[PDB]
């Protein structure tokens, strides 16, 4: 596993020893090379994971997450170099250092064998994101949003630590393999109920679960393009990965304690999908759609069936790619008009046709158009929920109806109609932005031909 970690570490002295006009080129090239190297982890087994050493291991669940995390960094560098042009060399290198540190922390988090190390890295990921949001954000709210990002997570994650060090004091180990093999049932008691709550809510906050989701429309909106990209694509999936990992020790209590969270998630799908219909901010609309999509993965993990787990993995990967592309597309318009109001700039299909095509593809993939992996994950989760309960089909389908509504609306408001007259500074799209959307969307369509690569260990 060190063959991926060490080059990511070497990215730092490389960036700090590069020329003032050569940091972006070298960083992008070597991050793409690291992604190519990380592609080798997709060769998984059918019975047990890839145990590299006592500290790091890779399963079929963490391999696609690793690949996506390594792939996102070149895209973040490509999207960030536009608005950081007037920045000084030292601060450019500091921003690239923040991105590299975030990638390294995510790489170590997705492969840690022991739960305490996983928690340590999973919490260490907060610092670079907070620094990026609160230092390179554009508006005055970026400070407050930062606080919302910091204290929402910690208030959920601090009890988790108290749980973890407790478990090692009773079972003797926190290694995932030992925990899986030596699993024991959870008795129905208040102490076990609160231990279940402590081991779960830390991942519910990061999803975010409906009710504890207020930090996301702030953090995603006020963050820069790379911050929002890393927040939507990868940082939201940490909760899902941790919950899928830790639900082993929670049975059979998960049958009883999941009802409030299940109800919250199935109603939050409708609530957030309806909120998306009336949103004057485009970035806020994308952020709320992210919560609407993550509620489905919450339900899938809670119902605890193999089809649900496969659907959750596929939906996590697909949503990461789709949300990253949508945030990039919104940022392209923002860098022209310097406003996030959706109705300010209209009829952009006439002026930017290829960008309109990118918008159409992103919108179609967002609403789970078959045979995209978004649709595969959504349909697997729907079938698992229908097996869990038939009446669920009333809600999920309703959500689908709303999902296609606010998506195409978002496409109609910005791309169709007539252009606003007073705006006259809409320059043709650069090759960098078009390449960014192409690199966002081509793997998304490529993953259709090989879905088993992103279906998790339950395949």
């Amino acid at each position: 596993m060190l063959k991926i970690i060490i080059p990511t570490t070497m990215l730092l002295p490389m960036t700090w020893m590069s020329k003032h006009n050569m940091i972006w080129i070298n960083a992008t090239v070597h991050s793409l090379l690291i992604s190519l190297i990380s592609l080798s982890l997709l060769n998984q087994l059918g019975e047990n994971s890839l145990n590299f050493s006592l500290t790091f291991f890779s399963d079929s669940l963490s391999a696609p997450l690793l690949v996506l995390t390594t792939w996102l960094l070149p895209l973040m560098l490509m999207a960030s170099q536009s608005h950081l042009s007037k920045e000084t060399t030292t601060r450019k290198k500091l921003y690239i250092t923040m991105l590299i540190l975030l990638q390294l922390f995510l790489i170590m988090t997705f492969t840690a064998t022991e739960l305490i190390l996983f928690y340590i890295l999973f919490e260490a990921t907060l610092v670079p994101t907070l620094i990026i949001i609160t230092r390179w954000g554009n508006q005055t709210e970026r400070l407050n949003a930062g606080l919302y990002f910091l204290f929402y997570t910690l208030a959920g994650s601090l009890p988790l630590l108290v749980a973890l060090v407790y478990i090692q004091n009773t079972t003797g180990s926190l290694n995932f393999l030992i925990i899986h093999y030596w699993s024991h049932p959870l008795s129905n008691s208040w102490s076990n109920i609160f231990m279940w709550l402590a081991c779960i809510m830390a991942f519910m906050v990061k999803m975010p679960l409906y009710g504890l989701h207020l930090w996301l429309p702030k953090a995603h909106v006020e963050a820069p393009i790379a911050g929002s990209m890393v927040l939507a694509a990868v940082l939201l999936k940490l909760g899902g990965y941790g919950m899928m990992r830790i639900t082993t020790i929670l049975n059979p209590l998960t049958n009883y304690m999941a009802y409030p969270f299940l109800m919250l998630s199935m109603w939050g799908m409708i609530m957030t999908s309806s909120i998306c219909l009336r949103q004057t901010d485009l970035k806020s609309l994308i952020a709320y759609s992210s919560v609407s999509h993550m509620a489905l993965v919450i339900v899938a993990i809670m119902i605890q069936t193999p089809w649900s787990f496969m659907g959750a993995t596929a939906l996590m990967i697909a949503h990461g790619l789709t949300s990253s592309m949508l945030f990039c597309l919104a940022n392209t318009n923002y860098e022209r008009v310097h406003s996030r109001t959706m109705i300010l700039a209209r009829g952009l299909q006439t002026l930017l046709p290829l960008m309109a095509t990118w918008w159409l593809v992103a919108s179609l993939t967002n609403l789970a158009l078959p045979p995209s992996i978004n649709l595969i994950g959504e349909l697997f989760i729907i079938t698992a929920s229908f097996s869990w309960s038939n009446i669920t089909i009333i809600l999920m389908g309703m959500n689908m109806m709303i999902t296609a509504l606010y998506s195409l609306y978002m496409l109609i408001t910005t791309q169709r109609g007539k252009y606003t007259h007073h705006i006259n500074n809409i320059k043709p799209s650069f090759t960098r932005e078009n390449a960014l959307m192409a690199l966002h969307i081509l793997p998304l369509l490529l993953l259709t031909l090989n879905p088993k690569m992103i279906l998790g260990p339950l395949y």
Partner: protein, 178 residues
């Protein structure tokens, strides 16, 4: 759509608008031409019956009952011209309307084609640039200190001037841009 609106519609304008609307809806009801001519003459006689009423209260009441009768008897599916706000080709060609400033972002290879057109465009741009200050001064001097009471704009008054705020009116894309 070119004329500046007024603060209110006088009685004469209201009656004329009602007459035109009633004639249009009658034509919608009377599909055949001769029948429409017959009933249009009947409607014109009905309107001329009170052509010289001097009691303004009585005239207003008569107009109110005429409006009520029209609203009751209007055609649910009146004929609309294709390019009218309700027609089948109202905003059909808006997707083909491109603003002219986009031509400023063309690559030099694209501007290599159509050289005479871009020379004339440069002449037009110079003409626009050379006359903006005079138009602003004319607007400042003609406008009352409180502000413009209406949206009507004054014409050019000297010899070498152009009417103020003329660029976007003159440089409209087209009615059939493609």
């Amino acid at each position: 759509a070119f004329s500046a609106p007024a603060a209110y519609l006088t009685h004469q304008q209201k009656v004329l608008r009602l007459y035109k609307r009633a004639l249009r809806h009658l034509e919608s009801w009377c599909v055949h031409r001769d029948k429409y001519r017959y009933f249009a003459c009947l409607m014109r006689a009905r309107f001329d019956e009170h052509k010289n009423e001097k009691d303004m209260v009585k005239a207003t009441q008569l107009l109110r009952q005429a409006e009520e009768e029209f609203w009751y008897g209007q055609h649910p599916q009146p004929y609309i011209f294709p390019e009218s706000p309700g027609g089948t080709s109202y905003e059909r060609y808006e997707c083909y309307k491109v603003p002219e400033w986009c031509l400023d972002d063309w690559h030099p290879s694209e501007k290599a084609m159509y050289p005479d057109y871009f020379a004339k465009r440069e002449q037009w741009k110079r003409l626009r640039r050379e006359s903006w200050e005079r138009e602003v001064k004319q607007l400042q001097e003609e406008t009352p200190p409180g502000g413009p009471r209406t949206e009507a704009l004054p014409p050019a008054r000297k010899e070498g001037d152009l009417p103020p705020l003329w660029w976007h009116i003159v440089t409209r894309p087209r009615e059939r841009p493609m």
